[PDB]
Structure formats: C-alpha cells, structure tokens
Design a protein around this ligand. Structure first.
Ligand SMILES: Oc1ccc2c(c1)CCN(c1ccccc1)[C@@H]2c1ccc(OCCN2CCCCC2)cc1
Ligand SMILES: Oc1ccc2c(c1)CCN(c1ccccc1)[C@@H]2c1ccc(OCCN2CCCCC2)cc1
Lengths: 231, 231
C-alpha cells in the first residue's frame, strides 16, 4: 500500500479502471421524447455499481473502515462520474460522450431546466483537459485523489480511529502525488514545470467539486452505498 | 508582474492584506436576540469592499478586463471570506473568530436553520490548518490562487481576448505556485515534501469551494462588484 512503487501505483489504478457503459436507449425510437434526465439517471445508477468495484481496488481504500469507505464515496460519487465524463469527452469538442451511443451537444442540454448550465461547465472542463493535454495515467491519479480527498475533511470526529484513518488517507494521497510527479518527470518536464502542472491539475478538482455541487442541486445514498460496499 | 521574484510576490501579497474588521454589535445588549445572520451579513458586506482593494493589489489582477475582474470576484468572493475566517480562527479550537469581538463556538451556530452544518465544516478546515501548521506566507498565496482560479473555467468564451486572459491568469497562478514551493524549500522541506505539501494545500481549496457552495445555498452581485471595481 504505502510501499507501492510509482509505476506500480499506475499499473494498479489503470487496471482498476471501470468499464465504459452504454445508455439503455432504444435506437429506433424518436429521441425528442426519450426523457433526457431519465437516460442520464439510469446510466449513472449503473456506473455507480462499477464505481464501488473500482474504489475497492484503489490502494489503501479497503484498509479503511466500512463507514469511512461509505462516507468517502458518498462525498465523491458525482465528482467521479463527472471527471470520467469529461475525460471521455476530451476528444469530442462541443459534445459530451455520456456513453458511446449517447453523444450530446450543447443544444441537447436545453432539454431540462437549468441543465445547459451544467453541460457548459462540463464542456469547459473537457476543453481545459484538451488544453493541458492530460494523459491517461494523470487522469486515473486524479480520479483516485478525488475519491480519497473529497470527504476527508468532513468526518467530523477526533476519535483515535478517525485520526488514524485521516492519517492513512493523506498518506495514500501523498503516494499518489509522488506518482503524478514521477510521471511528469519521465515526460521530460523540469522540476518547475512538474510543480506548475501538478498545481494546474489539482486546481481543476476545485472546479469539479463546484460542478458536482451544482449537479447535486439540480439533482438514503449512504445505505445504498453501504450495501454495495459491505460484501 | 510575470517577472516578479518569489520573495517579491510574498512581500506584494502580504502588503495587500485587508484589515481585520469588527462586528457592529452593541456589546451592552443581550446576545440571544442580536440576529446571528444579521451580524454575519453586515460584517461580510463590509469586508467585501476591502476585498476589492485587496484584489486590485494582487499582481496581474488589474491587467485583466474589468468584466473578467468582476467574473473572478463574483466566483470567489465567498471562498475568500471563508478562507480568511478559517485562518484567523486557526488558533481558536472549537471557535470561529468572525471578528475580534465576535468569537462564536459550535452551539451558537444552532441559532439559524442549517447554519451549524456550515460552522462545523469551517471548524474542520480551521483544524486542518492547525494540523498542517500553515504559515502566513502560504496563506496569502492560497487566497490569491482562489481569486484567480475559482472563475477561470467559467468564462465560457473562446474569443482571442478571452484566450489571452485565461492564458495570463494561469501564468500568474504558475508564478504563485513557484512562490509556494520557494517558501517550502526555504523552510527546509525536501523536494518530495515540497510536492506533497503543495498538493495538500491546493486540495483543501476543493473543500473551500464546497463550503462556499453550501454557503451560497443557505445564503445583482455583478453590478455591485462592477461599481466597486470600476473606479
Ligand atoms: O457518467 C455520468 C453519468 C450521468 C451523469 C454524469 C456522468 C455527470 C452529469 N450528470 C448530471 C448531474 C446533475 C444534473 C444533470 C446532469 C449525469 C447524472 C448524474 C447523476 C444522476 O443521479 C440520479 C440519482 N441516482 C439515484 C441512485 C443513486 C445514484 C444517483 C443522474 C444523472
Ligand atoms: O469574513 C466572513 C464574514 C461572514 C461570513 C463568512 C466570513 C463565512 C461564513 N458565512 C456564512 C455564509 C453562508 C451561511 C452562513 C454563514 C458568513 C457570511 C457570508 C456572506 C454573507 O452575505 C450576505 C449577503 N451579501 C449581500 C451584499 C453582497 C455580499 C453578500 C453573510 C454571512
């Protein structure tokens, strides 16, 4: 876990990658009446299941407490669905690849009230990824950081156990930071460029947190998540 | 601007620091009827004015477009008020130093509906700052990063001007990253520790974004901000 090598962390995360699901939409039926929200909703609910399997495979995650594992996913679930959406949409300018059979552009967002706001923020993030030429290895590191970071400041506890957990989460996270830098070092970037790029990458996560928040508004999960985790 | 030296960036930001305002509350009147929200509201509205002066003094900020300057403050205003609150509350465990004459603890939050949620998140952030032993120089760098970063992904424009602006904002931001590292290098931290600490610092900003979002819910600003900026 905390002994994992940089290259081993990347092989470990890359291997943990979830599958790219398809939208359960009837291709022969008129789209102008498919219920946009309904499609996205059913899609996300199915990815959530695979998200758990993925999370269980992120180094150090299963070491935590079941209830801590739930808390973290409960805080990050939507941010992870989003950063994943933005990634696969990276090479699709002006469009969002929700699923191989569900590629929507701006206008298609004006379907539901206030959904075009969220699409634009997503497209913009996708665009930034294009601008930075984000790499698949950098991507998985970021998605793992989101998972371990998003809920680590809201355990609201100072018990010895919560203290060892928080400690352990920031130790894995540090490992991921080291890994990100390693990648950038190998790409040829100087020390300065490594720091600057690391910062540019982490700061985009603030934007993903914000999008998630807007998404939560437009949109118990704990028990649902629990049952999936506790196998 | 983009030529500023590390030590010059810190002297520049430290000098730009706003004043620590007081709550306009009658000390001889019973507090159980002072209207908690009213106090906080009037306080923030006054700090906002000083926030503009401060922003105008952040290197590279005034170089932007007035409308870009407004957009950035409109996106970050509450996050900045919050990171400032958390900072001055750092040495006050279990309490929030909203102002020298307004130090409130947990329970005092149960005043308004759902306000104790926000206080707890704030206390937790303050606690993390204590855990990391954040330094005044690191603090100002972070507050400047928030200002330039929070709204840089939502300009929703690809005009040449918007492209040069975004470019220019990420160039100042990189300067601040270099500065943060410089500080950590001088503190004695190794290269590895520098990277890890930079990451831990930036990631807390995601949490500040989240708190701001919750704060915006519980809670035009553009025109208001405009008038203050355009002097
Ligand atoms: O990979 C995916 C799949 C779907 C989505 C994204 C990524 C990001 C943007 N997004 C969204 C979020 C809010 C408003 C509009 C769109 C959709 C989305 C996300 C979540 C969602 O949830 C429906 C409720 N559902 C109930 C069971 C537990 C899981 C959540 C419904 C749609
Ligand atoms: O330095 C300060 C001063 C006040 C506050 C913070 C920091 C952070 C937490 N916080 C808050 C935010 C939402 C809910 C509860 C508390 C208060 C706060 C923040 C903003 C606020 O705004 C009232 C509306 N006001 C109208 C004019 C433009 C500026 C905004 C009222 C209270």
């Amino acid at each position: 876990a905390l002994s994992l090598t940089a290259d081993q962390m990347v092989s470990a995360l890359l291997d943990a990658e979830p599958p790219i699901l398809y939208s359960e939409y009837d291709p022969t039926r008129p789209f102008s009446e498919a219920s946009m929200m309904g499609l996205l909703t059913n899609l996300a609910d199915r990815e959530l299941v695979h998200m758990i399997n993925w999370a269980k495979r992120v180094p150090g995650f299963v070491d935590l407490t079941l209830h801590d594992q739930v808390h973290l996913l409960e805080s990050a679930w939507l941010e992870i669905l989003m950063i994943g959406l933005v990634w696969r949409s990276m090479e699709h300018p002006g469009k969002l690849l929700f699923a191989p059979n569900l590629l929507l552009d701006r206008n298609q967002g004006k379907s539901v009230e206030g959904m075009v706001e969220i699409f634009d923020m997503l497209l913009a993030t996708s665009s930034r990824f294009r601008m930075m030429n984000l790499q698949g290895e950098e991507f998985v590191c970021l998605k793992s950081i989101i998972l371990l970071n998003s809920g680590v400041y809201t355990f609201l506890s100072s018990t010895l156990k919560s203290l060892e957990e928080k400690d352990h989460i920031h130790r894995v996270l540090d490992k991921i930071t080291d890994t990100l830098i390693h990648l950038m070092a190998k790409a040829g970037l100087t020390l300065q460029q490594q720091h600057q790029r690391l910062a540019q990458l982490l700061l985009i996560l603030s934007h993903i947190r914000h999008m998630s928040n807007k998404g939560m508004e437009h949109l118990p999960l704990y028990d649902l998540l629990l049952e999936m985790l506790d196998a």
